[PDB]
Amino acid sequence: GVPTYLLPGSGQFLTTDDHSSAPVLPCFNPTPEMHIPGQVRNMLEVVQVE
């Protein structure tokens, strides 16, 4: 097999991490998207309103 070694930080939980993780419900289909008014994508759009 592959020879490996573990780094410092192995097994820690960091609240700002970004990884893939195991799906609970396999083959699940989420509900279709539809148009809804007033979508927001950056909080600097809100901050520009009086």
Binding site: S20, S21, P23, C27, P30, G38, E45, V49
Partner: peptide
């Protein structure tokens, strides 16, 4: 970016959409 799961919702977060339109909140007038 690493993903070996079959379901697409298992993936990491998406942080690349830089599109904006403030005018729908700041200028909602005809």
């Amino acid at each position: 970016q690493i993903n070996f799961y079959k379901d697409s919702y298992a993936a990491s977060a998406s942080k690349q959409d830089f599109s904006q339109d403030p005018s729908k909140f700041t200028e909602p007038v005809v």
